[PDB]
């Protein structure tokens, strides 16, 4: 009758999950498992005819948690759509049956990931761009098959949980206008690192910037406020309005851009005290900079 | 050729700049400084055996 | 003698079934499919403002029965998309309708940014009468006289879309092409039927391309050819100062209606009055007003930000696809980077840069909307941290 989709990104970091313990936490890298068992397990009891999907964010790749990469999730995909060669598990839905085998692919992919984090190579951090790359080419791929008679109703749901690396923010927004093409919504689940880039995925296309408080505190935060019925979003009202705001400023300098120009005729955004090029390899007339230096 | 010239120019001169807008940076460097120095070696055993 | 010829003809007619057999109507299905022209045309433009002044025909012979009964709802109707795409990749440039009727060039709209303005005054012009005589050096020198108030660093192309009649030249239009080229615009002419050679060579001096539409089809897939910047680059039209940059604002604090909302009476945003829930604001100015990237009436220059208004026309730039490599072994991971699963039907897509496989509904994401590649994030800032 209708079916519906929960992309979620894990930011498993461990070398933030690693350090939260020490601080005398209850909400360490165990628990976070559970935040996926509780929601993949709410989504269902509304629907049986759903699907799950939950991508994750290590230092090194984002690797998919369910549907795995091996031989068993990888090539055979285990969704409740798919009857044939796909029933001792899939058949009990409604109830632990087909849940509890939609963690276990989680619980056995994060084998393979846990075990390669040598840590050898200094730091590297989380690459968090990359994550969501990922989720635009799955729910593109499933939209293709299930466009005839049904619509398939999804959203996108973000969980950060560290800061960036060395990685060139302009992949991070490629991803959000690419997005609005589909109509699709994109959240953002922030828990303690901060970031100006994430917000503009909520304010572009509509989303929510959620602040986590406490981490115990997560079950209230995602099945109410992050639902994906997204029926009655509009007339909520449960998160604290937003009152900071953090945007774009220059690209190669050290300013906060607000009236300045660009090197040329190029696309980077600089300051307006440059009369000649500075990193490319063009021209300018001066017609200008005699104007601009004098007020 | 001019605009295929450009954008590895804009691409390659943001690495060694990156994320130097505001506290984009000192929020960064300050989970690397409190976990410890990383080139001692002894460091980089206890952060895979945790 | 009509029986003579009409009772053998039934006979060889009736026998339809023999030609079945055959598979002529199977094997040209085949090869005319596997025909897949290369002809990748470097349009791309560093110039990010854009001026435009598409020019609409309004005669008797838009309402021919070629692609449907009633020409004049098919470009009407058409026109909206293109409008509101202009606006998705370009939001900070601004477009603009002028109609042509009763031998006159009459202005409709004027030169302003903003989507809701252009697409409600389209489906004004279904009601308008279609009289006939089109007269193109009306709607053309008109056009001329509005764009040269503009500083001289935008492509400023204009664009003249009519129902291909037979040499639309009113009075030597040749004589004009002299005149057009000093102030440095550029005129792009679309063809619906027949050909059109005396606006070929004003499309090639000025600077543009010349199609015909086909189909249906084929007319949506040329508009998406001019949402991309003319390909150009000229050394008179490359100065431009002071960008306007506004920030996002709420006007409120908890809840919109305990406060005065935005654009209301006593506001300054008087120019779209209502009841909205926020926009922008000139940080020279401090003038709040609608969020549409418009020319502010206070500084005269419209607003280029950098999250959703100048990012918009960067998420164009790379338009790049990916290659093919045929083997008859059967290998090659066969796991897609994206979606993993693949298709397992002769479709291998590698990259050029981290060399990822891809699936058919992966590679028309990416020339579509994703515009790079997921493999370019694992991969490329990988050695510089
Ligand atoms: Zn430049
Ligand atoms: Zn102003
Ligand atoms: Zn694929
Ligand atoms: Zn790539």
Same mark, same amino acid.
């Given at each position: 009758?209708?079916?519906?989709?929960?992309?979620?990104?894990?930011?498993?970091?461990?070398?933030?999950?690693?350090?939260?313990?020490?601080?005398?936490?209850?909400?360490?890298?165990?628990?976070?498992?559970?935040?996926?068992?509780?929601?993949?397990?709410?989504?269902?009891?509304?629907?049986?005819?759903?699907?799950?999907?939950?991508?994750?964010?290590?230092?090194?790749? %984002?690797?998919? $948690?369910?549907?795995?990469?091996?031989?068993?999730? &990888?090539?055979?995909?285990?969704? /409740?759509?798919? *009857?044939?060669?796909?029933?001792?598990?899939?058949?009990?839905?409604?109830?632990?049956?087909?849940?509890?085998?939609?963690?276990?692919?989680?619980?056995?992919?994060?084998?393979?990931?846990?075990?390669?984090?040598?840590?050898?190579?200094?730091?590297?951090?989380?690459?968090?761009?990359?994550?969501?790359?990922?989720?635009?080419?799955?729910?593109?791929?499933?939209?293709?098959?299930?466009?005839?008679?049904?619509?398939?109703?999804?959203?996108?749901?973000?969980?950060?949980?560290?800061?960036?690396?060395?990685?060139?923010?302009?992949?991070?927004?490629?991803?959000?206008?690419?997005?609005?093409?589909?109509?699709?919504?994109?959240?953002?689940?922030?828990?303690?690192?901060? %970031?100006?880039? $994430?917000?503009?995925?909520?304010?572009?296309?509509? &989303?929510?910037?959620?602040?986590? /408080?406490?981490? *115990?505190?997560?079950?209230?935060?995602?099945?109410?406020?992050?639902?994906?019925?997204?029926?009655?979003?509009?007339?909520?009202?449960?998160?604290?309005?937003?009152?900071?705001?953090?945007?774009?400023?220059?690209?190669?300098?050290?300013?906060?851009?607000?009236?300045?120009?660009?090197?040329?005729?190029?696309?980077?955004?600089?300051?307006?005290?440059?009369?000649?090029?500075?990193?490319?390899?063009?021209?300018?007339?001066?017609?200008?900079?005699?104007?601009?230096?004098?007020? | 050729?001019?605009?295929?010239?450009?954008?590895?120019?804009?691409?390659?001169?943001?690495?060694?700049?990156?994320?130097?807008?505001?506290?984009?940076?000192?929020?960064?460097?300050?989970?690397?400084?409190?976990?410890?120095?990383?080139?001692?070696?002894?460091?980089?055993?206890?952060?895979?055996?945790? | 003698?009509?029986?003579?010829?009409?009772?053998?003809?039934?006979?060889?007619?009736?026998?339809?079934?023999?030609?079945?057999?055959?598979?002529?109507?199977?094997?040209?299905?085949?090869?005319?499919?596997?025909?897949?022209?290369?002809?990748?045309?470097?349009?791309?433009?560093?110039?990010?403002?854009?001026?435009?002044?598409?020019?609409?025909?309004?005669?008797?012979?838009?309402?021919?029965?070629?692609?449907?009964?009633?020409?004049?709802?098919?470009?009407?109707?058409?026109?909206?998309?293109?409008?509101?795409?202009?606006?998705?990749?370009?939001?900070?440039?601004?477009?603009?309708?002028?109609?042509?009727?009763?031998?006159?060039?009459?202005?409709?709209?004027?030169?302003?940014?903003?989507?809701?303005?252009?697409?409600?005054?389209?489906?004004?012009?279904?009601?308008?009468?279609?009289?006939?005589?089109?007269?193109?050096?009306?709607?053309?020198?008109?056009?001329?006289?509005?764009?040269?108030?503009?500083?001289?660093?935008?492509?400023?192309?204009?664009?003249?879309?009519?129902?291909?009649?037979?040499?639309?030249?009113?009075?030597?239009?040749?004589?004009?092409?002299?005149?057009?080229?000093?102030?440095?615009?550029?005129?792009?002419?679309?063809?619906?039927?027949?050909?059109?050679?005396?606006?070929?060579?004003?499309?090639?001096?000025?600077?543009?391309?010349?199609?015909?539409?086909?189909?249906?089809?084929?007319?949506?897939?040329?508009?998406?050819?001019?949402?991309?910047?003319?390909?150009?680059?000229?050394?008179?039209?490359?100065?431009?100062?002071?960008?306007?940059?506004?920030?996002?604002?709420?006007?409120?604090?908890?809840?919109?209606?305990?406060?005065?909302?935005?654009?209301?009476?006593?506001?300054?945003?008087?120019?779209?009055?209502?009841?909205?829930?926020?926009?922008?604001?000139?940080?020279?100015?401090?003038?709040?007003?609608?969020?549409?990237?418009?020319?502010?009436?206070?500084?005269?220059?419209?607003?280029?930000?950098?999250?959703?208004?100048?990012?918009?026309?960067?998420?164009?730039?790379?338009?790049?696809?990916?290659?093919?490599?045929?083997?008859?072994?059967?290998?090659?991971?066969?796991?897609?980077?994206?979606?993993?699963?693949?298709?397992?039907?002769?479709?291998?897509?590698?990259?050029?840069?981290?060399?990822?496989?891809?699936?058919?509904?992966?590679?028309?994401?990416?020339?579509?909307?994703?515009?790079?590649?997921?493999?370019?994030?694992?991969?490329?800032?990988?050695?510089?941290?």
């Amino acid at each position: 009758d209708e079916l519906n989709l929960l992309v979620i990104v894990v930011d498993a970091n461990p070398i933030w999950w690693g350090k939260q313990a020490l601080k005398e936490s209850q909400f360490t890298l165990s628990k976070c498992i559970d935040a996926v068992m509780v929601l993949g397990n709410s989504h269902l009891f509304m629907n049986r005819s759903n699907k799950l999907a939950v991508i994750a964010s290590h230092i090194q790749e %984002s690797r998919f $948690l369910y549907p795995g990469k091996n031989g068993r999730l &990888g090539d055979f995909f285990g969704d /409740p759509g798919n *009857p044939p060669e796909f029933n001792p598990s899939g058949s009990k839905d409604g109830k632990y049956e087909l849940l509890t085998s939609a963690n276990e692919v989680i619980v056995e992919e994060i084998k393979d990931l846990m075990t390669k984090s040598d840590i050898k190579g200094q730091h590297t951090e989380t690459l968090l761009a990359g994550s969501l790359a990922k989720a635009l080419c799955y729910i593109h791929r499933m939209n293709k098959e299930v466009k005839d008679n049904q619509e398939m109703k999804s959203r996108i749901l973000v969980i950060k949980a560290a800061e960036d690396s060395a990685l060139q923010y302009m992949n991070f927004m490629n991803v959000i206008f690419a997005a609005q093409k589909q109509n699709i919504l994109i959240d953002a689940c922030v828990l303690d690192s901060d %970031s100006g880039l $994430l917000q503009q995925a909520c304010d572009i296309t509509g &989303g929510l910037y959620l602040k986590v /408080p406490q981490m *115990p505190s997560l079950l209230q935060y995602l099945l109410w406020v992050f639902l994906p019925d997204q029926d009655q979003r509009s007339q909520l009202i449960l998160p604290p309005p937003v009152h900071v705001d953090y945007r774009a400023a220059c690209f190669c300098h050290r300013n906060l851009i607000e009236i300045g120009y660009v090197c040329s005729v190029c696309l980077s955004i600089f300051c307006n005290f440059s009369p000649i090029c500075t990193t490319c390899e063009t021209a300018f007339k001066i017609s200008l900079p005699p104007v601009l230096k004098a007020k | 050729k001019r605009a295929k010239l450009q954008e590895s120019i804009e691409y390659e001169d943001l690495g060694k700049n990156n994320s130097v807008k505001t506290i984009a940076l000192n929020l960064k460097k300050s989970d690397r400084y409190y976990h410890g120095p990383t080139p001692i070696q002894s460091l980089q055993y206890a952060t895979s055996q945790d | 003698r009509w029986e003579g010829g009409y009772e053998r003809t039934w006979e060889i007619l009736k026998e339809d079934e023999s030609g079945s057999l055959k598979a002529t109507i199977e094997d040209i299905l085949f090869k005319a499919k596997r025909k897949r022209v290369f002809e990748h045309h470097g349009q791309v433009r560093l110039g990010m403002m854009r001026h435009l002044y598409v020019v609409v025909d309004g005669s008797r012979t838009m309402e021919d029965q070629d692609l449907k009964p009633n020409r004049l709802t098919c470009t009407l109707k058409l026109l909206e998309y293109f409008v509101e795409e202009y606006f998705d990749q370009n939001p900070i440039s601004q477009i603009g309708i002028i109609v042509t009727k009763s031998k006159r060039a009459e202005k409709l709209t004027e030169l302003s940014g903003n989507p809701r303005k252009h697409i409600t005054s389209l489906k004004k012009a279904v009601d308008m009468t279609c009289h006939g005589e089109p007269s193109l050096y009306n709607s053309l020198s008109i056009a001329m006289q509005t764009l040269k108030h503009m500083p001289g660093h935008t492509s400023r192309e204009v664009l003249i879309i009519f129902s291909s009649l037979t040499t639309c030249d009113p009075s030597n239009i040749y004589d004009l092409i002299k005149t057009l080229k000093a102030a440095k615009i550029r005129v792009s002419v679309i063809g619906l039927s027949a050909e059109v050679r005396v606006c070929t060579v004003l499309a090639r001096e000025t600077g543009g391309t010349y199609h015909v539409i086909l189909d249906e089809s084929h007319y949506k897939e040329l508009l998406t050819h001019h949402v991309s910047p003319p390909p150009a680059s000229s050394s008179s039209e490359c100065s431009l100062i002071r960008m306007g940059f506004p920030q996002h604002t709420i006007a409120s604090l908890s809840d919109q209606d305990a406060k005065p909302s935005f654009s209301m009476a006593h506001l300054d945003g008087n120019t779209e009055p209502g009841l909205t829930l926020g926009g922008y604001f000139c940080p020279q100015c401090r003038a709040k007003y609608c969020e549409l990237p418009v020319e502010c009436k206070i500084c005269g220059l419209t607003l280029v930000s950098a999250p959703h208004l100048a990012r918009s026309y960067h998420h164009l730039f790379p338009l790049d696809a990916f290659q093919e490599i045929p083997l008859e072994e059967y290998n090659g991971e066969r796991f897609c980077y994206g979606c993993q699963g693949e298709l397992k039907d002769q479709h291998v897509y590698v990259c050029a840069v981290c060399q990822n496989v891809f699936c058919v509904d992966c590679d028309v994401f990416v020339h579509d909307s994703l515009h790079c590649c997921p493999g370019c994030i694992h991969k490329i800032p990988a050695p510089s941290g």
